Design a protein around this ligand. Structure first.
Ligand SMILES: *[C@@H]1O[C@H](CO)[C@@H](O[C@@H]2O[C@H](CO)[C@@H](O)[C@H](O)[C@H]2NC(C)=O)[C@H](O)[C@H]1NC(C)=O
Ligand SMILES: *[C@@H]1O[C@H](CO)[C@@H](O)[C@H](O)[C@H]1NC(C)=O
Ligand SMILES: [Ca+2]
Lengths: 465, 165, 55
């Protein structure tokens, strides 16, 4: 299984004026593609012959010197390589002694130290690009045509250039990045909820870091794809089109320079979209193979939340105790239920203040026993309305996708933990009712014994009379 | 209302209205009087004519806002919903007797208003199965009993801290 | 109601409501689990209600 990243080169830096963007793909600038468009513009005018001699020395100096300067900033790329790989895995951070918040600051310093290297070694070459651009302007000054200039090359270069537009796929990148970004924000929302239950600090730092880099690459993907779609929109917007038979020389220079730069944006865009596409798919598969170490440390948290959070082992004891109390009371009335029939047949012919005590206590005993049976029925009814809830969460934990690919199963497990969290108040107040009815079963449990004592006093006093 | 979780949710929303770049976000607080449960339980409890053996039905988890702190005994008389049409359709005289009604089709406060105009003492409100089909029979709920709206201990004028209450 | 009747502001309310009213509405069992049990597609209906308030 893949736990490391091999290709790192998606880092890029722009100038302080934001005019030029450097990339780590060749030719490291957009303007070389404009120059290769300007060759195909210079082939159609016989006036500009010296461009084919000058620009060979110029752009050979630019490509050799630019690839040279990246060759100078290779060495920081190797250290940020080792820093990503050590900081990212649990095993490599396990063999590394320093803490995680310690090493991530080293990641920051080496990161902007690396991008600072790359810009600081291209600072001169930006001025070089200014100088060559002034030479293109100077050679385009030498055109003979002063006032009535076609505008026959231009309308055709929109056609041949439009074939290069129809070659590229655009829909798959848009649908891809919208689906992917949906999965990203779902993941970042998911880790915040998942880091409160589960113990381990290492894998959770790996996933938080990889989602940070994943966020960076999503940002660059949106940027380059935006410039591609804007370039295509402007060029096809010029293909309506305004049709002069003649233009000014500086107007013609503004035209060729103009949509030549749009070729530079587009051809600079395609390979960057390819590289970032590989980057998002690879980092995605790293994150899935990181959550595969987490679900087994989550499953026992579900199986720990159920048995303790539905209050089952305590409530079953309450129903057991109240059941034994009912068997105690009906056991005592089973003992003296003949003795009442001995103590009803005598007294009915005499000084009857004494029945006012007796049938009082007998009606108290009967209605007390019926009260205890009704109490037991109430508590068991509450218990059924709790165990139905527990059974339903068991039925949701039984049925899962199997066939769950990828990370959707960890979202199912977290949804089950929320399905235990949404049902706490019902079980709390229901268990409070169970406590109340058990208390009053204790009160009738002492009252019935006082009644039996009064019945015995009745018996001996009837024996006295 | 007034709990700590309300104020944490209000800080979360008042953070969101800042993060969405609204033109202006503002808070407005004021002090009101609500009614909350006491530390002692409130119960409904069957009393025999003898006064000897006393049987209880429920300690309700849910309460009614703006009720009175009292305790009473007496006859119970069913009423449909507490419409005025219901109380004038009844055969049994209403007065001096606690009533029961079913929740729904009218605000709670107009049930208690009609049962107060017909000089009754007590109101118990429940949910049958026909109007409200559920499975859990041991379930409680909540309602305000104030006819009209607003904070009732300051009617007409607002409940800021300039009124000095 | 206090916007329309007390203040004088035109007020509007609306609901996608089943014929019988919602059972556990002021209740301790009002929660998202049983809500998504009642309504199996909540995202589309919330999309519709936010669309109406948008109009
Ligand atoms: C606004 O009125 C409230 C209500 O009395 C004041 O809040 C109380 O202040 C007293 C004394 O400071 C304390 O008992 C508590 O801080 C508050 N009581 C309760 C029950 O919340 C508040 O001080 C008033 N505001 C101002 C600026 O005076
Ligand atoms: C009011 O209630 C008492 C209950 O004792 C009843 O006797 C009386 O008749 C009632 N009043 C009227 C006017 O019916
Ligand atoms: Ca007021």
């Amino acid at each position: 299984s893949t736990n490391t990243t091999d290709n790192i080169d998606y880092f890029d830096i722009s100038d302080e004026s934001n005019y030029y963007l450097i990339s780590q793909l060749r030719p490291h600038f957009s303007n070389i593609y404009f120059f290769d468009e300007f060759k195909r513009y210079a082939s159609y005018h016989t006036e500009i012959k010296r461009y084919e001699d000058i620009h060979k020395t110029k752009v050979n100096s630019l490509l050799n010197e630019a690839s040279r300067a990246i060759g100078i900033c290779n060495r920081a790329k190797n250290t940020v390589k080792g820093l990503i790989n050590i900081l990212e895995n649990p095993q490599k951070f396990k063999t590394q002694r320093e803490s995680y918040d310690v090493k991530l600051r080293q990641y920051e310093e080496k990161k902007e130290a690396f991008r600072g290297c790359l810009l600081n070694k291209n600072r001169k070459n930006l001025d070089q690009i200014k100088k060559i651009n002034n030479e293109i302007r100077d050679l385009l000054e030498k055109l003979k045509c002063s006032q009535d200039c076609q505008t026959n090359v231009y309308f055709d270069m929109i056609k041949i250039y439009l074939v290069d537009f129809k070659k590229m796929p655009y829909e798959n990148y848009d649908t891809f990045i919208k689906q992917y970004k949906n999965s990203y924000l779902s993941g970042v929302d998911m880790i915040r909820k998942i880091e409160k239950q589960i113990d381990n600090p290492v894998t959770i730092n790996a996933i938080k870091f990889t989602q940070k880099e994943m966020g960076y690459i999503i940002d660059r993907f949106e940027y380059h794809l935006q410039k591609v779609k804007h370039s295509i929109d402007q060029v096809t917007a010029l293909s309506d089109g305004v049709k002069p038979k003649q233009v000014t020389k500086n107007r013609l220079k503004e035209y060729y320079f103009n949509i030549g730069n749009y070729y530079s944006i587009f051809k600079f865009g395609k390979d960057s979209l390819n590289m970032l596409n590989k980057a998002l798919i690879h980092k995605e598969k790293i994150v899935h193979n990181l959550l595969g170490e987490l679900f087994g440390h989550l499953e026992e948290r579900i199986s720990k939340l159920i048995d303790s959070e539905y209050f089952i082992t305590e409530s079953n004891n309450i129903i057991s105790q109240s059941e034994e109390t009912l068997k105690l009371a009906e056991d005592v009335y089973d003992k003296n239920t003949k003795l009442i029939e001995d103590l009803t047949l005598y007294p009915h012919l005499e000084i009857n203040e004494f029945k006012k005590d007796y049938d009082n206590n007998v009606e108290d005993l009967r209605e007390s026993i019926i009260y205890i049976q009704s109490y037991v029925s109430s508590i068991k009814s509450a218990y059924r309305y709790n165990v139905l809830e527990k059974d339903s969460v068991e039925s949701k934990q039984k049925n899962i996708p199997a066939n769950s690919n990828a990370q959707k199963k960890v979202d199912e497990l977290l949804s089950i933990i929320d399905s235990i969290s949404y049902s706490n108040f019902s079980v709390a107040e229901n268990f409070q009712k169970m406590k109340d009815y058990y208390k009053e079963i204790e009160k009738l449990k002492i009252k019935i014994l006082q009644l039996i004592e009064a019945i015995k006093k009745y018996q001996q006093h009837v024996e006295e009379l | 209302a007034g709990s700590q979780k309300d104020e944490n949710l209000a800080l979360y929303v008042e953070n969101q209205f800042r993060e969405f770049k609204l033109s202006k976000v503002w808070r407005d607080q004021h002090f009101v009087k609500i009614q909350v449960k006491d530390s002692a339980q409130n119960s409904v409890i069957i009393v025999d004519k003898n006064g000897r053996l006393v049987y209880l039905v429920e300690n309700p988890g849910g309460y009614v806002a703006y009720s009175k702190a009292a305790t009473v005994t007496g006859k119970l008389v069913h009423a449909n919903f507490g419409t005025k049409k219901d109380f004038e359709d009844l055969y049994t005289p209403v007065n001096g007797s606690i009533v029961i009604v079913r929740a729904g089709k009218i605000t709670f406060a107009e049930k208690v208003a009609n049962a107060e105009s017909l000089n009754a003492i007590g109101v118990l409100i429940y949910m049958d199965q026909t109007k409200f089909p559920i499975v859990n029979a041991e379930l409680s709920f909540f309602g305000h009993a104030h006819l009209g709206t607003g904070d009732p201990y300051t009617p007409g004028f607002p409940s800021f801290n300039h009124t000095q209450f | 109601f206090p916007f329309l009747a007390y203040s004088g502001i035109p007020a509007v309310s609306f609901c996608f409501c089943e014929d019988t009213d919602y059972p556990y509405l002021g209740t301790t069992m009002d929660t998202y689990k049983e809500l998504i049990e009642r309504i199996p597609e909540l995202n589309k209906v919330a999309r519709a209600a936010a669309e109406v308030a948008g109009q």
